[PDB]
Design a protein around this nucleic acid. Structure first.
Ligand SMILES: [Mg+2]
Ligand SMILES: [Zn+2]
Ligand SMILES: [Zn+2]
Ligand SMILES: [Zn+2]
Lengths: 66, 436, 196, 84, 49, 113, 263, 49, 133, 97, 140
RNA sequence: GGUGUCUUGGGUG
């Protein structure tokens, strides 16, 4: 839905890295290199960001009803 | 409802009298029931969705009936096959096999914790098997702590001597294990094992407490030892792979020779059997023995540290066929007792040519699960599994009908005070029950 | 995704769970005794592929009937600085001592199924009865009772518990009182209890 | 007419599991209705355990009437059947 | 859905058949009394108009 | 709906003592201690501290159920020593060791700054 | 006798080797730092207007998971030990979040930096959401479109990680000992050779590998422990370590107190 | 309705395994322990409790 | 104060089946036809082929709850390198002068042949085994 | 010798055959030829064969009781309504089935 | 297109590589079948890809050719009961029951078919870190 | 103080 604040397994804060990750993917860096640069070293933290599906973009498309 | 109240506990279907047993209550949080794991065998239960019913007796007479007739300790031995039905299962087994190996040693601090974990421990620390240069206890000592005193057990496995080079067989003297790995043959539900012996000599209460003592000791030791399984436990080295593939090629050549003999009118028939049925029986024999030989090679390749081998050797899960199918060859698929029929015109699948009797055409799967099945082999194995699912889904109704009819036929039959076995009309069925 | 269903038996906190040398702790610990007799090798292969994909930052391809092999995946995994078969040295959470055996460790895709215990837990002491039979109604939502069917009766008969059976079928269910004529044996007796 | 004399009683001298269960249940129910207790109650308050104590000391004042398939019966006091 | 019905223990129409290849999924079928009677189309299956 | 509160792990009630000592009569000069609202963190520390004293002959602990936040500890000592006294001695020793550890860590951290 | 040797020391993490201590001590320290070091986290949320697509308790869970500066949290009181019938200014920190999208294009992101501390037991340095830099935007909380609004009053309280993971000052405490398996505490699974098939520990070069002529030693215990504490910014690494030590000290002092005053 | 029937004073829920229970023990949830009941006659041994 | 003193020459050592345990065979150097088969912990007392072991069997270490030994006390085990405690579970008073004793050291097994005059006093409940070199 | 089809009485007479040991797997034939006790023996043999085929072991007394109920009246009583409901028991038992 | 009846008369190559017999020795990759009985094959058709025989539910399974078929059937049944995000407009719909996972994650090991099944756009699971161990006995 | 009946389809054990 929206990026989780913490890593499930260990609890590192990954919620402040989604925008940097998107900008890194924009400038051509492949996913492993982007995750390396954000200093996500444990594969739990890495799969937190690598497997996220951002559905809030899809939910926001339905007009506010008030 | 409070602690130690007797309640009747039940899982459907109730196929035998040990599907409904009386338990003592212990109140706990969460919304799920809790069962000791050794009683999951008589219920035929597991923990992947199952539900069970609890009935509360509403008077003192029904409380006494439950506690004195239906209680779990009283049902350990069954009259169906005069053997125990509750045994040691899963980790407690695998763990006791690993713990009672000859080269398993324990230091003083883990020994102290394990001793304190035994509810019936009498507070006396046994002398260590090794006193110098460092006190070490063996797992056999710690397991012998669990067994009550006054127990003698003796088993011979393949004519072993009293010095047991393989550490097989079993000798128990005054409740202490002298030699022998403790596995399914000793703490399983088979007859003549340790559970049956303790039941017959000490009674149902001490036998019930034996399950708990052994479970606690082995679970602590396994918690601090560990046991796992990985993809590497199903992988055989190159030489065993060469042996397996050579055996499979030899069997394919044998099948091709049988095919040539049948086509040139040289096959030797069997009594009560057609030339085609003889041909099919001979081919099935050949391919089954091929799979068995490849499996034997794969099993021989496995080290004593292989985790699959440890689970099989403990007898807690899996068998030789599982190792064979995982590592060497899935083998031949059968649909309704026969090989894969020619569902298309003169072929099994439209990727074969007509009248091709080779093992690959009619459902022999040459690969293992590790290697992966081809699409044809995948489809044939799916057909066989579908046959199994249909059988499982469809036969249970006939079986339930048969058991209902048997119960209605025999429901009115009771042993009377004069020893006779009579029905509700008073007519004699047997002058003495069981003739003994 | 390989037929490996199960329910949660217990939950442990972060500090109680076993950890690897990198401080990674598992979300989930399943039992080894579900692999051998079920022969779900794809589960282990997929755990290995998922580990490699998460380490190298891509998604593993697990399409059936492709030319991928376990050996290539293990070569990649060892090149990434991990034991090539997915084993890791883990430590005991309670004591910090190493485990004597190494543990197959990695990510696996799990599913949250619709069956929750809180939608199934039901108890009934006394409650609504049926109009016709005066027996407990049927249904968890209606606060019903559980059926003590025929095979349950067979098991109680095998146990020889006659009193328990009578109490299940009478005082825990539709017990009633009727007056019969001692001469004609029909329940046609008109009774006025307040007038005796 | 249907009672059997104490000399020709040919049933087992041992309390069966069903007889023991019902005797204990009935005694426990009786004691829970403020009946007098024959044993010395030291620690236990549960009527079932008190009934077990009475059963062991052969002090339960009850009678088992064992019906035969022909309708006749034998009478055995609880104190004279043998408890294991 | 094949409307055979459960009145009859003929296991033949419940069976995965050779001609099912490519047309109906070899693995997806309900457990129990609908096993083999309720089928599921393969991804590239198509029904003529 | 049956889940207990997550603070009952550590918050001691007013009617529940923190610590309760009973003697083990089977062996001489031994005591059984039940620690309420504690877990392996204190238990393992105390156990491995006590296991290294010459006058302590037996020491062990267990957490009988993971869903209940307590542990029970069995501790025996020699004839002259009392197990209680050995328990205060172990507590004081671990306190001193932790204080020394803190001092050295602070000095190292300051130099590293 | 205990010794500490710091190998790397920055604000979020400290990597240190611990020596001349028992393994139980090191593991107790790891457990205490993971579970029993108090911090501050939002424990009570009050919704005024939430017209976002996200649910009220979804946003509440996310807000509870936001790290807050907890440097002075030890001078604060547990909300179960204050005489106040309702959290007073001294046992809680009150935060405000107000967000709103004006305009008919674009999406307004709601970040943790938008949280504003209103009250709290001043001048204690608690409560502020942790920023990485001066220009940090914090954690993503929600997203807002036209006329969607978020008006929230959060309460923050003192707690430990036993009660809920949101009070954990640490993410992952790496911990290991005996890189060369001299003590033989593990027994390596292998296919061909156990030395080739197992990667070396990252602290292998800190200890001498065993010589082939060497025999097994049955007197050696574990004596050197390599551990890397990491934080979420709520506390600093040295603060986490020192307060874990202090928490262990006070637990032991509690035990000592009960023993002496049960006499 | 006569050979089998629905009964009061019963409960049902998912089962779980517990290595720390005795063989003849079953763990009962608090909510079920409070919903179900046992009628206990008051006597001079249980009146205080 | 000992029951059976002797010196043995190790003949074969087959580690094979186990990793920390090896079975050794040894004939007495002074009185052949006295055979000894024994399982021993490798990591506590490594043994090589043709090595010479002084083996003692005793019913006590003096000159019921095990507690760790102090430095200050003394026992018979002070002069040896490898001490084990075991249970005699078979005394085979067999052929002419073949006498076999079977001892289980917590699952580590021992067999000892020889004439009756050597092993007559080895008919005990529990036996210590002590080893040098 | 093993043979397809069944004729016990006439094959039993054929010279060269051990007339005292010929056996049939149709116990109805046994009943018609050899009597009811031989029928009981054959019935137990068949049930034991079917059960113990796969290595399962059922204690003797249970199958003995089952075969004694089926041969108690002098003729083979099948375990069906057509067998069970021709007894002299009460109406309520028969209706309950 | 071919229906079941026409399939009787055709000779289908299983993969595009099967159209030519190769002359290997890979102990890991499975031996693609010899097909030696027939001297010269006259193929008329080729499969586009053999994995297309599976349906919607079976296509989620990773490496279904390494499993025994009953487990594939059980997963085909159980994957339909898995909490996910059935639709993106679940907030303007009013249904009797609905379950939405908080944080759906796409799988780390994926099949090609899920690109067409939208399983990566509307996932129904989470990648947990799993150890396989007999840790304390509560997972038996 | 009193929360109704029957069939169809999809699952869990
Ligand atoms: Mg199940
Ligand atoms: Zn992480
Ligand atoms: Zn009348
Ligand atoms: Zn306050």
């Amino acid at each position: 839905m929206i990026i989780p604040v913490r890593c499930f397994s260990c609890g590192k804060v990954v919620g402040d890295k989604w925008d940097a990750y998107l900008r890194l993917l924009e400038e051509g860096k492949q996913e492993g290199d982007a995750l390396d640069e954000l200093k996500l070293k444990r594969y739990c933290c890495r799969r937190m960001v690598l497997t996220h599906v951002d559905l809030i973009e899809k939910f926001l498309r339905y007009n506010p009803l008030e | 409802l409070m602690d130690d109240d007797p309640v009747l506990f039940n899982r459907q279907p109730s196929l035998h009298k040990m599907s409904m047993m009386a338990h003592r209550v212990k109140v706990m949080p969460y919304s799920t029931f809790r069962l000791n794991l050794s009683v999951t065998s008589p219920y035929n239960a597991d923990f992947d969705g199952d539900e069970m019913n609890l009935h509360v007796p509403q008077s003192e007479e029904t409380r006494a009936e439950l506690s004195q007739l239906c209680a779990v300790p009283l049902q350990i031995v069954s009259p169906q096959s005069n053997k125990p039905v509750m045994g040691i299962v899963q980790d407690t087994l695998c763990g006791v096999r690993k713990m009672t190996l000859r080269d398993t040693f324990i230091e003083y601090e883990q020994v102290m914790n394990m001793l304190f974990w035994v509810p019936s421990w009498d507070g006396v620390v046994p002398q260590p098997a090794i006193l110098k240069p460092k006190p070490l206890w063996t797992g056999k000592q710690l397991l012998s702590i669990a067994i009550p005193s006054g127990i003698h057990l003796q088993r011979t496995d393949g004519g072993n001597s009293l010095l047991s080079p393989k550490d097989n067989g079993m000798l128990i003297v005054d409740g202490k294990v002298m030699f022998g790995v403790v596995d399914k043959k000793t703490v399983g539900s088979g007859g003549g094992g340790l559970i049956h012996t303790v039941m017959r000599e000490k009674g149902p209460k001490i036998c019930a407490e034996l399950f708990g003592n052994i479970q606690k000791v082995v679970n602590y030791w396994l918690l601090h030892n560990g046991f796992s399984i990985g993809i590497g436990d199903a992988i055989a080295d190159a030489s065993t792979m060469k042996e397996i593939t050579h055996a499979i090629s030899s069997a394919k050549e044998q099948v091709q020779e049988i095919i040539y003999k049948a086509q040139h009118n040289e096959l030797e028939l069997k009594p009560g059997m057609t030339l085609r049925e003889s041909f099919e029986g001979e081919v099935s024999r050949t391919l089954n023995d091929a799979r068995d030989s490849a499996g034997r090679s794969a099993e021989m390749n496995l080290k004593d540290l292989n985790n699959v081998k440890q689970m099989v050797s403990a007898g807690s899960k899996g068998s030789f066929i599982n190792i064979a199918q995982m590592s060497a060859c899935v083998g031949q698929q059968m649909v309704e007792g026969k090989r894969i029929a020619f569902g298309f015109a003169d072929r099994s699948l439209p990727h074969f040519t007509k009248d091709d009797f080779s093992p690959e055409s009619k459902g022999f799967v040459e690969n293992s699960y590790l290697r992966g099945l081809t699409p044809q082999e995948f489809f044939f194995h799916a057909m066989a599994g579908r046959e199994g699912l249909i059988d499982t889904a469809v036969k249970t109704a006939e079986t339930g009908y048969i058991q209902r009819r048997l119960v209605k036929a025999l429901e009115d039959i009771m042993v009377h005070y004069d020893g006779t076995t009579r029905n509700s009309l008073g007519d004699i069925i047997q002058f003495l029950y069981g003739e003994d | 995704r390989h037929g490996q269903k199960g329910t949660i038996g217990v939950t442990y906190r972060h500090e109680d769970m076993p950890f690897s040398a990198e401080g990674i702790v598992p979300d989930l610990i399943i039992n080894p005794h579900a692999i051998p007799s079920r022969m779900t090798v794809a589960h282990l292969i997929e755990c290995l592929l998922s580990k490699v994909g998460s380490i190298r930052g891509y998604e593993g391809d697990a399409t059936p009937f492709t030319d991928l092999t376990v050996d290539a995946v293990s070569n990649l995994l060892r090149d990434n600085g991990y034991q090539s078969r997915g084993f890791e040295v883990m430590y005991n959470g309670h004591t910090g001592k190493k485990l004597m055996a190494q543990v197959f460790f990695g990510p696996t895709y799990y599913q949250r199924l619709r069956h929750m215990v809180d939608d199934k837990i039901h108890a009934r002491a006394r409650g609504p009865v049926q109009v016709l039979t005066r027996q407990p109604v049927e249904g968890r939502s209606r606060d019903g009772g559980l059926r003590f069917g025929e095979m349950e009766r067979d098991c109680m008969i095998a146990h020889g518990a006659a009193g328990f059976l009578k109490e299940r079928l009478m005082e825990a269910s539709d017990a009633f009182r009727v007056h019969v004529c001692g001469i004609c044996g029909l329940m046609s007796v008109i009774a006025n209890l307040k007038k005796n | 007419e249907l009672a059997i004399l104490k000399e020709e009683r040919t049933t087992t001298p041992y309390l069966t599991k069903y007889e023991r269960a019902r005797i204990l249940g009935t005694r426990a129910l009786q004691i829970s209705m403020n009946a007098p207790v024959l044993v010395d109650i030291e620690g236990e308050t549960d009527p079932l355990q008190i009934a077990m104590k009475e059963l062991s000391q052969r002090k339960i004042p009850l009678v088992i009437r064992r019906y035969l398939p022909d309708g006749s019966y034998e009478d055995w006091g609880c104190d004279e059947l043998i408890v294991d | 859905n094949t409307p055979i019905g459960r009145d009859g223990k003929l296991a033949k129409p419940r069976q995965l058949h050779n001609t099912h290849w490519g047309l109906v999924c070899p693995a997806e079928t309900p457990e129990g009394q609908a096993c083999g009677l309720v089928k599921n189309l393969s991804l590239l299956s198509g029904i003529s108009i | 709906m049956n889940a207990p509160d997550r603070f009952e792990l550590f918050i001691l009630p007013d009617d529940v003592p923190k610590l309760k000592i009973t003697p083990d009569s089977r062996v001489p000069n031994c005591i059984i201690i039940k620690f309420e609202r504690e877990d392996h963190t204190l238990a393992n520390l105390l156990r491995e501290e006590l296991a290294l004293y010459p006058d302590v002959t037996f020491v062990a602990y267990k957490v009988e159920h993971p869903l209940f936040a307590n542990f029970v500890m069995r501790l025996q000592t020699e004839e002259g020593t009392r197990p209680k006294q050995a328990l205060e001695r172990a507590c004081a020793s671990i306190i001193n060791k932790l204080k020394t550890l803190d001092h050295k860590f602070n000095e190292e951290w300051n130099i590293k700054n | 006798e205990p010794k500490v040797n710091i190998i790397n020391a920055q604000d979020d993490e400290v990597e240190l080797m611990l020596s001349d201590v028992n393994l139980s001590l090191a593991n107790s320290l790891r457990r205490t730092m993971l579970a029993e070091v108090p911090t501050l986290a939002i424990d009570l949320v009050e919704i005024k207007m939430n017209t976002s697509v996200l649910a009220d308790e979804f946003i509440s869970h996310r807000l509870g998971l936001i790290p807050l500066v907890s440097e002075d949290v030890e001078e604060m009181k547990y909300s179960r030990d204050c005489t106040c019938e309702d959290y007073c200014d001294e046992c809680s920190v009150v935060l405000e979040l107000s967000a709103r999208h004006e305009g008919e294009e674009g999406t307004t992101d709601v970040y943790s930096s938008s949280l504003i501390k209103v009250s709290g037991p001043g001048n204690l340095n608690v409560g502020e959401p942790v920023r990485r830099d001066d220009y940090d935007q914090g954690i993503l909380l929600c997203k807002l479109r036209n006329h969607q609004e978020l008006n929230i009053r959060c309460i923050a309280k003192k707690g430990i990680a036993k009660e809920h993971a949101k009070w954990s000052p640490c993410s992952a405490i790496a911990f290991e000992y005996d890189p060369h398996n001299k003590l033989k505490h593990t027994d390596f699974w292998f296919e061909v050779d156990a030395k080739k098939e197992w990667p070396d520990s990252k602290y292998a070069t800190w200890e001498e590998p065993p010589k082939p002529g060497e025999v097994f030693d049955y007197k050696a215990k574990p004596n050197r422990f390599y551990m890397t504490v990491e934080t979420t910014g709520s506390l600093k690494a040295n603060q986490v370590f020192s307060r874990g030590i202090k928490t262990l000290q006070e637990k032991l002092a509690n035990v000592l107190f009960e023993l002496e005053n049960s006499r | 309705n006569l050979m089998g029937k629905r009964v009061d004073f019963s409960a049902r829920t998912v089962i779980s395994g517990d290595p720390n229970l005795e063989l003849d023990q079953v763990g009962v949830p608090i909510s079920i322990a409070k919903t179900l009941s046992y009628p206990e006659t008051v006597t001079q041994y249980n009146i205080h409790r | 104060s000992a029951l059976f003193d002797d010196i043995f020459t190790v003949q074969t050592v087959d580690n094979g089946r186990y990793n920390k345990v090896s079975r050794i065979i040894g004939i007495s150097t002074t009185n052949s036809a006295i055979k000894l088969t024994l399982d021993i912990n490798n990591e506590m007392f490594p043994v090589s082929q043709d090595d010479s072991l002084t083996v003692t069997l005793a019913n006590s270490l003096s000159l019921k709850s095990w507690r760790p030994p102090k430095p200050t006390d003394k026992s018979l085990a002070d002069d040896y390198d490898y001490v084990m405690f075991g249970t005699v579970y078979k005394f085979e008073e067999g052929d002419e002068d073949k006498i076999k004793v079977y001892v289980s050291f917590g699952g580590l097994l021992m067999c000892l042949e020889g004439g009756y005059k050597s092993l007559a006093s080895l008919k005990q409940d529990n036996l210590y085994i002590l080893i040098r070199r | 010798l093993e043979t397809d089809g069944i004729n016990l009485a006439e094959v039993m007479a054929v010279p060269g055959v051990d007339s005292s040991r010929t056996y049939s797997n149709s116990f109805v034939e046994i009943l018609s030829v050899l009597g009811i006790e031989a029928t009981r023996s054959s019935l137990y043999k068949e049930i034991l064969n079917v059960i113990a085929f796969d290595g399962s072991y059922v204690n003797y007394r249970h199958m003995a009781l089952l075969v004694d109920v089926m041969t108690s009246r002098g003729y083979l009583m099948a375990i069906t309504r057509h067998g069970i409901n021709r007894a002299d028991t009460g109406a309520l038992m028969r209706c309950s089935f | 297109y071919v229906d079941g009846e026409e399939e009787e008369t055709i000779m289908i190559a299983m993969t595009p590589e099967d159209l030519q017999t190769r002359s290997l020795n890979d102990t890991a990759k499975r031996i693609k079948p010899e097909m030696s009985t027939s001297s010269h094959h006259t193929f008329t058709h080729c499969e586009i890809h053999p994995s297309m025989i599976l349906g919607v539910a079976a296509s989620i399974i990773p490496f279904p050719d390494h499993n025994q078929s009953p487990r594939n059937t059980y997963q085909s049944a159980m994957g339909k009961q898995a909490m996910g995000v059935f639709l993106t407009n679940y907030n303007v719909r009013m249904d009797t029951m609905a379950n939405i996972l908080y944080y759906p994650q796409k799988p780390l090991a994926k099949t090609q078919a899920m690109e067409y099944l939208k399983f990566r756009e509307l996932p129904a699971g989470q990648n947990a870190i799993v150890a396989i161990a007999c840790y304390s006995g509560y997972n038996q």
